[PDB]
Amino acid sequence: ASHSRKFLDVRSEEELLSCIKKETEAGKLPPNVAAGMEELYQNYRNAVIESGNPKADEIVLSNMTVALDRILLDVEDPFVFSSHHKAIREPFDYYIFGQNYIRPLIDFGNSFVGNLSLFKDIEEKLQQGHNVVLISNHQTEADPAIISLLLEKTNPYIAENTIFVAGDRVLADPLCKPFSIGRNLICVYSKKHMFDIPELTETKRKANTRSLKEMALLLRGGSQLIWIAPSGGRDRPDPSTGEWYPAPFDASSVDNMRRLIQHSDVPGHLFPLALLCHDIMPPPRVIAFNGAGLSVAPEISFEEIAATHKNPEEVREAYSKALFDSVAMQYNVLKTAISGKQGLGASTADVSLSQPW
Numbered sequence: 001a002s003h004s005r006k007f008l009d010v011r012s013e014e015e016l017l018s019c020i021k022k023e024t025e026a027g028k029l030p031p032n033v034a035a036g037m038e039e040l041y042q043n044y045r046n047a048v049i050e051s052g053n054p055k056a057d058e059i060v061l062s063n064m065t066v067a068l069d070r071i072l073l074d075v076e077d078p079f080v081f082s083s084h085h086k087a088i089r090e091p092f093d094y095y096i097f098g099q100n101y102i103r104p105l106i107d108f109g110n111s112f113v114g115n116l117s118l119f120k121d122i123e124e125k126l127q128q129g130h131n132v133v134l135i136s137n138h139q140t141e142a143d144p145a146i147i148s149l150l151l152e153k154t155n156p157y158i159a160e161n162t163i164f165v166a167g168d169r170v171l172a173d174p175l176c177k178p179f180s181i182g183r184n185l186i187c188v189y190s191k192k193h194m195f196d197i198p199e200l201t202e203t204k205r206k207a208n209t210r211s212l213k214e215m216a217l218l219l220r221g222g223s224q225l226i227w228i229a230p231s232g233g234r235d236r237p238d239p240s241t242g243e244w245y246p247a248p249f250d251a252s253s254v255d256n257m258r259r260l261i262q263h264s265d266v267p268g269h270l271f272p273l274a275l276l277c278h279d280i281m282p283p284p285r286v287i288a289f290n291g292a293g294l295s296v297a298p299e300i301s302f303e304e305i306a307a308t309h310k311n312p313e314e315v316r317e318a319y320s321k322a323l324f325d326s327v328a329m330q331y332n333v334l335k336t337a338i339s340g341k342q343g344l345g346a347s348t349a350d351v352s353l354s355q356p357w
Contacts, residue, residue, distance in 0.1 A: 003076055004028060007069040016041065016064060023072065033075055036175045037068055043287040048104045051289035056104075063101050070097065070178035081171045083211040084218065085185040087160070094182025095160065099152070101179070102145040105280050107291045111150060112337045112344075114274070114295025114330055114351040119155045122225070122271065122296070126157075129222040131268040133257055134162070134296065135323045137246035137331065138229030140281040141170050144183045147227070147275065150294045154356050158225060163218075165228040168193055186215045191250060192232040219264040227273070230254045230320070234283040244278055244335075246327050251320035258302065258319070269299050272323045274330035276338060293334030295351055297326050 006023065010016045017038070024034040041064055049056045070092075088094045113119075122132050140146070144166070148159035163184040170176045171187055188211050189204040218224050231247035238245070261268035276293035300322040302315075309315045330351050337346035337353055347353045 001076065003073050005069065007065055007072060010061075010065050013045075013061065016061065016068070020068070028072070029075060033071070033174055036173075037071065039285075040064075040067070040175060043285075044105075047287040047289050051104065051107065053104055059104050063104070066097060067101060067178065070094075071174050074174040074177045078174065079177055079181055081180070081185065081187045083187055083207075083214040084163075085180075085183075085187060087184045088181050094178060096182070098145045098179045098182045099149060102142055103149055105142075105287060105289055106146065106149055106277075107289055108355070108357045110291030110338060110343075111357075112291070112293045112295075112334060112346075112353045112355060113150055113154075114293070114333060114353055115297060116154060116352075116354050116356060118271070118296045118298070119151060119158060122269075123155060123157055125267075125269060126223050126225055129266065131219050131222060131224045131226070131261060131264060131266055133261060133268070133270045134225070134227045134273040135249075135254065135257070135270050135327070136227055136229050136273040137235055137275055137327055138231065138233065139235050139244075139275060139278040140283070141176060141234075142179070142281050143229075143275060143277065144227070145179065146277045146280065146292055147294060150292060161225055163224060163226045165215075165226065186211050186226070188212070190232040191253070216260055216264070219260060219266065219268070222264075222266040228253070228257060230257070235278060236283065246274070246324065246331050249320045249324045251317050254320040254323060255316045270323065271296050271299055272326035272330070274327045274334060276331060276334040291338045293331075293338055295330040295334055295353075297330055297350060300326065 006019050010019055020034055020037050023029050044064060045060045048060050053059060125132055144164045152159040161184060163186055165186045165188050167188045168190050170180050188208050194201055194204055230249040230253040232250055233247060235244055235247045237243060258270060261270065274295045279288055279290035280292060281287055300319065302319055305319045305322060306315045309318050333346050333348055333351040336342050340346060344353050
């Protein structure tokens with residue numbers, strides 16, 4: 001069994017669309033995957049053309065041709081994710097593939113980074129051998145790429161070496177897998193969906209145990225940069241007001257992360273991180289060109305929280321809530337800069353915004 005390379009011979013939208021139909025009729029694409037490709041093509045095309053980019057036609061055809069080639073390759077021979085997955089960069093550079101694919105969807109012109117200088121401080125801690133965990137919200141299946149693209153110029157180390165805790169659809173759906181192959185990951189089934197199919201819960205636990213043992217081993221070696229969203233899912237708009245805010249954190253996931261970092265025999269840090277990009281690829285399909293925001297702020301002192309609270313349970317919830325409140329402060333600044341149309345004027349004493357592209 002060899003890989004079919006027909007999508008690479010495509011030279012137009014018509015040939016690209018016919019190639020989907022031709023591969024489907026030849027039985028090489030299940031109907032759901034063929035439909036998802038059509039949807040992906042149309043939505044991506046519209047978003048890039050809608051953006052006004054002078055090179056939209058070329059960009060769409062190029063990026064979609066490669067994407068469809070790589071998706072088909074995964075349908076033919078599905079990648080299996082190791083507990084810890086290192087980004088594949090050779091012989092096909094899946095990291096660059098994913099960067100290039102998402103780049104045209106971000107309106108850099110209206111995108112913002114909060115507290116850039118702190119990402120440099122994060123690099124200096126990693127240079128010292130410390131471990132750093134970014135405690136973040138999560139908005140789209142493309143978060144890792146969006147994070148990486150916003151920091152690619154100023155902090156390429158972070159952009160390429162961050163290890164994302166991720167799992168579920170992005171590691172299973174062939175439309176998403178080629179993107180994930182190009183990222184460093186710790187593969188974990190979310191608590192959120194753990195019970196969706198009860199017959200599979202034990203299998204998921206066992207897999208999460210392997211991944212978490214591997215993550216602890218990595219932390220023992222030091223210099224790890226890990227991203228995790230303790231809400232365990234993507235943010236959703238308020239059902240009443242329609243307003244988007246970071247989803248509440250699972251305080252136990254936070255506490256587990258803090259404990260691992262404390263018991264790694266290596267100095268570690270948890271920083272609150274906010275990301276704003278739901279418009280680009282929103283959760284329940286839809287793709288749009290839009291500005292994005294990323295911000296980090298200083299670590300919360302667990303000691304101070306422990307010193308001002310009355311018992312263990314209250315301390316754990318207060319610590320998670322302090323991280324959440326920082327993420328939400330930062331997220332509000334990004335929101336104010338972007339949908340609030342304030343740009344850099346949204347800056348506050350806690351969040352200094354910049355556009356370093």
